[PDB]
């Protein structure tokens, strides 16, 4: 699909980038390392993580375990073996696959043959250690940052707020946030181009190996094919490759200059979304950027002039007599009418124009940046709210100055702080993305099925796990989403009926909440209620238009002889609190570390 000219251009870009960085490539790993053993220990640990839970194991699994054990026994020898393989082995055992069934979207599961898997692991770990050590991946890349997805989201929000005079709508200042997915970003990486790219960043042998690993025979259920074109996500290291490829895309988007700014100078790089000066920050439209895992998040802060230019070029390019293009717009359907992005002929045009520009910026043969898989939010005079999704959140950022009346900041709202003044300059209301809700629902469904054999305790345990995942991941943001609440009640009742069905009872009187919510210590089940919550059920026809104050409470998971079962949500520290708190405690730690230094003691 790639035009050779395009490939050449890409090469030029990447070369230019590393040139600017003084990025010394990763060597082929010799016997030199003090870390070698340590590195090995990580990979093994990771691999072990699969096997610690499931006691009954397959033949392949058993083999893998054995290999791991031997590796522990003979570390140096194992390392040597790995090295030899890397030097030599460019044809591997074929990769079996299956589909894990998330009932929306079935996900492919690649299963590499254990011997190569160790190699993949070690190589991967080494690459990450070397890359991060050498500052390959610039701050702006999200998923790998050593910060939690909700944390990441929070940081993003903070960055947005802390932009210099970002919320002004006075001098025709117009912000636009561009969410889009790099469609099939891995699934159309050509090995030739990929190989050459890697040969920039690492010792060519490693590159050769990696390219040869993606080129495997993909057996599935009696049908095979040589995976001639398209990276396989399910190798261990493949993530690194994807990330590296992502860098290319990022560079294409931002160009050498803006990217250079975001990274900072090579010797002393920027922190996540900091800038060496204000001037530099203000210079470009593209004030912030982050590619969380094949989903870029370009934030533009246009002026009236610039915006006018953009609309002009686009509109002239792609005309329309009426408003017209307001339909076929990717709005945030979870939010309410006057909450989500209003459809102004101007602002919408700008948004669409912006998207067009971005599309033009990336070559089509490399990846699919289809409008359909792209949400563009806009902030302006006529658009006060500013929306996006990230890490499966939906976040409506609304600045304090634009709010008509700042009520008692509710729950599931992050008050963002301006770094200069230290005032609560903007709010960020939080919903859970529909997609995440769907995923959760699918999880529940999965739990439910394949439970005719399974015993009540195990079922409840699984459900407990599911619930704790759902909350502990996005805690605060559950308050808002009524659909999620519904799912929780519905799901929880379904689980209860799994027990109650199991006893062929399925009846209210004879399963008082004793049996369910009492822990496993007392003959209970240990079910964790996210149920006996009162579901906030406001006026459905009005609520669609604007956010209401919650007026009417529906009864969620009810019961006769209603003992007020506490929820789980009250016993998890909501994220904003966790993050302010984090800032405090880490500050304290820092201060005490300084004290220790001064005093010359072990803190």
């Amino acid at each position: 699909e790639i035009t050779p000219e395009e490939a050449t251009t890409i090469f030029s870009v990447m070369v230019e980038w590393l040139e600017s960085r003084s990025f010394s490539p990763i060597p082929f790993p010799p016997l030199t390392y003090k870390n070698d053993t340590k590195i090995l220990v990580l990979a093994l640990e990771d691999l072990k993580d699969v096997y610690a839970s499931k006691v009954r194991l397959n033949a392949s699994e058993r083999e893998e375990l054995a290999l791991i054990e031997e590796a522990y026994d003979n570390p140096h020898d194992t390392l040597n073996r790995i090295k030899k393989y890397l030097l030599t082995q460019r044809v591997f055992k074929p990769v079996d696959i299956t589909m894990m069934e998330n009932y929306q979207n079935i996900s492919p599961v690649y299963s590499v043959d254990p011997l190569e898997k160790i190699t993949d692991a070690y190589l991967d770990q080494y690459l990450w250690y070397e890359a991060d050590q050498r500052k390959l991946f610039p701050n702006w890349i999200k998923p790998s940052d050593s910060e939690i997805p909700p944390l990441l989201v929070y940081k993003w929000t903070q960055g947005i707020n802390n932009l210099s005079e970002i919320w002004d709508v006075s001098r025709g200042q117009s912000a636009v946030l561009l969410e889009t997915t790099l469609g099939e970003m891995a699934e159309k990486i050509d090995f030739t181009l990929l190989n050459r790219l890697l040969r920039l960043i690492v010792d060519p042998n490693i590159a050769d190996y990696i390219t040869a690993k993606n080129n495997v025979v993909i057996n599935f259920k009696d049908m095979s094919h040589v995976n001639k074109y398209g990276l396989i996500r399910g190798l261990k290291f493949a993530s690194f490759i994807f990330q590296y490829y992502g860098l290319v895309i990022d560079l294409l988007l931002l160009g050498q200059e803006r990217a250079t700014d975001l990274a900072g100078p090579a010797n002393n790089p920027n922190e996540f979304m900091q800038f060496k000066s204000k001037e530099v920050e203000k210079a470009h439209p593209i004030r912030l950027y982050t590619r969380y895992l094949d989903r870029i998040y370009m934030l533009f802060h246009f002026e009236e002039d610039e915006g006018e230019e953009l609309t002009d070029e686009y509109l002239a390019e792609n005309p329309d007599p009426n408003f017209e293009n307001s339909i076929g717009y990717n709005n945030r359907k979870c939010w309410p009418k006057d909450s989500r992005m209003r459809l102004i002929r101007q602002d919408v045009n700008l948004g669409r124009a912006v998207f067009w520009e971005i599309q033009s910026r990336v070559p089509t043969s490399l990846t699919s940046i289809k409008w359909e898989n792209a949400f563009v939010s806009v902030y302006s005079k006529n658009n006060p709210n500013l929306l996006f999704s990230m890490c499966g959140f939906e976040v409506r950022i609304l600045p304090r100055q634009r709010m008509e009346e700042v009520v008692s900041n509710d729950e599931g709202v992050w008050d963002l702080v301006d770094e200069r003044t230290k005032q609560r300059t903007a709010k960020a209301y939080l919903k859970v993305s529909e997609e995440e809700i769907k995923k959760f629902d699918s999880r529940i469904r999965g739990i439910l099925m394949a439970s005719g054999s399974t015993t009540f305790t195990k079922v409840a345990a699984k459900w407990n796990t599911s619930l704790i995942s759902l909350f502990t991941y996005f805690r605060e943001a559950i308050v808002a989403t009524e659909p999620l609440l519904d799912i929780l009640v519905k799901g929880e009742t379904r689980i209860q009926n799994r027990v109650k069905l199991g006893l062929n009872s399925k009846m209210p009187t004879r399963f008082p909440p004793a049996v369910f919510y009492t822990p496993k210590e007392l003959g209970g089940l240990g079910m964790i209620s996210a149920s006996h919550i009162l579901i906030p059920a406001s006026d459905l026809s009005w609520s669609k238009q604007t956010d209401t104050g919650i007026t009417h409470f529906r009864a969620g998971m009810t019961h006769e002889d209603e003992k007020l079962i506490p929820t789980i949500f009250r016993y998890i520290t909501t994220w904003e609190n966790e993050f302010l708190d984090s800032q405090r405690v880490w500050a304290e730690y820092a201060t005490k570390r300084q004290e220790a230094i001064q005093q010359n003691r072990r803190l």
């Binding site: 030029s12 996900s107 469609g183 988007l253 160009g255 910026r361 070559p363």
Partner: peptide, 30 residues
């Protein structure tokens, strides 16, 4: 000025090859 500095500045009767079908597969795999 800022838009210059990029790298790129300016039916079939086969159920296995239908636009709907490929799209569907794209949707329901990841």
């Amino acid at each position: 000025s800022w838009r210059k500095g990029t790298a790129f500045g300016r039916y079939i009767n086969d159920m296995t090859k239908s636009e709907y079908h490929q799209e569907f597969l794209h949707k329901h795999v990841r």
